[PDB]
Design a protein around this ligand. Sequence first.
Ligand SMILES: *[C@@H]1O[C@H](CO)[C@@H](O[C@@H]2O[C@H](CO)[C@@H](O)[C@H](O)[C@H]2NC(C)=O)[C@H](O)[C@H]1NC(C)=O
Ligand SMILES: *[C@@H]1O[C@H](CO)[C@@H](O[C@@H]2O[C@H](CO)[C@@H](O)[C@H](O)[C@H]2NC(C)=O)[C@H](O)[C@H]1NC(C)=O
Ligand SMILES: *[C@@H]1O[C@H](CO)[C@@H](O[C@@H]2O[C@H](CO)[C@@H](O)[C@H](O)[C@H]2NC(C)=O)[C@H](O)[C@H]1NC(C)=O
Ligand SMILES: *[C@@H]1O[C@H](CO)[C@@H](O[C@@H]2O[C@H](CO)[C@@H](O)[C@H](O)[C@H]2NC(C)=O)[C@H](O)[C@H]1NC(C)=O
Ligand SMILES: *[C@@H]1O[C@H](CO)[C@@H](O)[C@H](O)[C@H]1NC(C)=O
Ligand SMILES: *[C@@H]1O[C@H](CO)[C@@H](O)[C@H](O)[C@H]1NC(C)=O
Ligand SMILES: *[C@@H]1O[C@H](CO)[C@@H](O)[C@H](O)[C@H]1NC(C)=O
Lengths: 73, 228, 318
Amino acid sequence: NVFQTRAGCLIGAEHVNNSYECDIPIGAGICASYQTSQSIIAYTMSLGAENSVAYSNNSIAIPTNFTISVTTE
Amino acid sequence: QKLIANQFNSAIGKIQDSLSSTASALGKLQDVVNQNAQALNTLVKQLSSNFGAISSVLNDILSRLDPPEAEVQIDRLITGRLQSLQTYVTQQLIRAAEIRASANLAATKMSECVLGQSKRVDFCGKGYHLMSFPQSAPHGVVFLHVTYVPAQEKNFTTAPAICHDGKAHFPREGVFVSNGTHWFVTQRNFYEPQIITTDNTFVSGNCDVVIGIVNNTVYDPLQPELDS
Amino acid sequence: ILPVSMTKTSVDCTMYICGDSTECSNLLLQYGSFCTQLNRALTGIAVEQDKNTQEVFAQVKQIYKTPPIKDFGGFNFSQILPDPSKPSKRSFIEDLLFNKVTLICAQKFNGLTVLPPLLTDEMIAQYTSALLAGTITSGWTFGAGAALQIPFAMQMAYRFNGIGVTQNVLYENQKLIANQFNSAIGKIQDSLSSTASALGKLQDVVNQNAQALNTLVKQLSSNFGAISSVLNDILSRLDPPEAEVQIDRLITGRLQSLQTYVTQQLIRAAEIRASANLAATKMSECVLGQSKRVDFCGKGYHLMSFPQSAPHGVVFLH
Ligand SMILES: *[C@@H]1O[C@H](CO)[C@@H](O[C@@H]2O[C@H](CO)[C@@H](O)[C@H](O)[C@H]2NC(C)=O)[C@H](O)[C@H]1NC(C)=O
Ligand SMILES: *[C@@H]1O[C@H](CO)[C@@H](O[C@@H]2O[C@H](CO)[C@@H](O)[C@H](O)[C@H]2NC(C)=O)[C@H](O)[C@H]1NC(C)=O
Ligand SMILES: *[C@@H]1O[C@H](CO)[C@@H](O[C@@H]2O[C@H](CO)[C@@H](O)[C@H](O)[C@H]2NC(C)=O)[C@H](O)[C@H]1NC(C)=O
Ligand SMILES: *[C@@H]1O[C@H](CO)[C@@H](O[C@@H]2O[C@H](CO)[C@@H](O)[C@H](O)[C@H]2NC(C)=O)[C@H](O)[C@H]1NC(C)=O
Ligand SMILES: *[C@@H]1O[C@H](CO)[C@@H](O)[C@H](O)[C@H]1NC(C)=O
Ligand SMILES: *[C@@H]1O[C@H](CO)[C@@H](O)[C@H](O)[C@H]1NC(C)=O
Ligand SMILES: *[C@@H]1O[C@H](CO)[C@@H](O)[C@H](O)[C@H]1NC(C)=O
């Protein structure tokens, strides 16, 4: 139970092939997180959550309806 | 209108909750207040440190020693503390200019965002921007950027022009679209199709140069009038 | 070409100052908080250095990617869009950059370590593949909401009106423009290939840091009026009540020489933080939108922009 990283020697967490959004960023793309029993998992972070837009040279997509957010700054 | 009001009225509500149920929204403000205080305590604790003096009480050296002794010590205290001010000072000057640079970022949002309507994308918060409400907060300020984010999309088949008679037509404002049977010219951010008549469209040159033009008939507003 | 982050170092206060001497480190106990408020500083930097890069690049919800097939109405991005046959997909231009810019363990020998950036030059180049693939397909709207496919040349028809040229220009000239644009891209390669003086900025930051390390290191070898700049020598040769007085000067000396090094960072690091935001803006207004602010986005009316990362930096093609 030791996972050598690009960052350094990580002791006490469980490498995970899966990749989730970043949580406790460590280094070099390795973001630990707590959940599954449970233990700390350290997994290469997923920049974002993938998408691809169906482009096509005649195909436009026009929102029909909106929202109003409110945010804070 | 009705809908929007609700969306907005509702939207306000969540803020209370976003703020009530969370201490991690205000981290920024909350931080500044630390780093200052954080930096004071440090400054204070420095009083208790010897800096290589025999003791960190000034009067002790004074008490126990005869001054030509204390002279040499009390240097180190002075030398020490005096330094430890400059460290504290400088840290402020820098920090204080990290605020001065975040005032102006407020003094701007306050000006452009509040007092105006901002065109600068994602300055005033993700989405197109409608208005904003400042709210002070301690040593801080808080904007509520009411912004307008579009939602439900419908693919369509667009074409950049229309050959009418061999003239083109291009939309005067916002894309052409069709849902696959009739062509419609809509405004670009909110699907609201409209039949295509010469008032939607202006004409430029003949067809062919256009790449992707498509056929259709552009109805005349007038002709029905001239129909009689 | 904007700097964005800077190399995040971090520095042990202690062993920098005291090599392997409790006797030293004991003395160092006296000054107290210093040793631990450097690290507070140099972390405060090194933390944000990954907030900068966060804000510049990660403005995008969802990593996008181009369609498989490139039908752009004639503009040709193969230069900029990620290079699939690269191992790390850094599209062509970005690679000119990583060459045009430039030991790592040489500086990390006296506690002066260099923590790796939160993001990795591989990721950075996924984002700027998003930004650059949403810009292309989705128009700008992907900053304002759900990305919306719109056919490019029915975008550059809008990014015209934004400059007050009626669109019937575009379609009627489309072919020409494509060439002008396709050509125009080309020269960049050459501007970058044949010249080391484009990237001076980025190239500089990287110096001044390293420049400032060496200085910091060399300070180890200086006497500061001590009998010698080796700690253990004084230790060796003298009996401590002697060394006590000396090792002050070393400590006093080095300790000072940190603060100088620290402060220089804090200032410098806030010269980046002020040039991140200038990127974090261009990235927002210029890329994700179309900017009306004259000569913000480069001389001329402004059509669009393509970011390209570059090491500790970012590069726009306006
Ligand atoms: C636009 O979207 C809003 C929600 O974002 C829709 O509002 C809901 O509409 C349904 C049915 O019309 C109602 O049952 C709900 O009460 C509405 N919600 C609110 C908060 O008012 C709205 O209908 C959508 N409009 C269109 C044309 O799709
Ligand atoms: C695309 O939208 C147009 C506009 O509504 C549709 O044409 C109309 O379709 C409705 C369907 O009930 C008819 O009642 C109208 O009489 C049609 N208008 C005309 C002028 O014929 C068209 O059907 C839509 N296409 C699709 C696939 O939804
Ligand atoms: C749009 O409709 C016109 C007809 O109004 C089409 O023009 C025809 O084009 C073909 C080949 O280019 C010629 O052989 C015909 O003689 C043309 N007809 C006329 C009346 O000029 C045009 O092709 C249509 N556009 C598309 C994209 O199909
Ligand atoms: C887009 O531009 C790139 C580079 O300008 C083109 O790449 C060259 O394409 C020719 C084909 O005409 C090949 O023979 C060369 O090997 C390519 N050069 C390089 C460096 O890869 C590309 O073909 C263009 N594609 C489009 C669709 O415009
Ligand atoms: C990770 O996954 C790869 C394939 O996804 C598999 O071959 C490998 O054994 C896994 N290893 C670990 C440590 O999960
Ligand atoms: C439009 O078509 C694309 C093609 O894949 C699809 O991804 C998208 O969901 C479609 N839009 C709607 C509203 O169905
Ligand atoms: C769009 O691309 C398709 C590819 O299937 C091509 O056949 C068609 O000519 C193109 N038309 C336009 C208007 O781009």
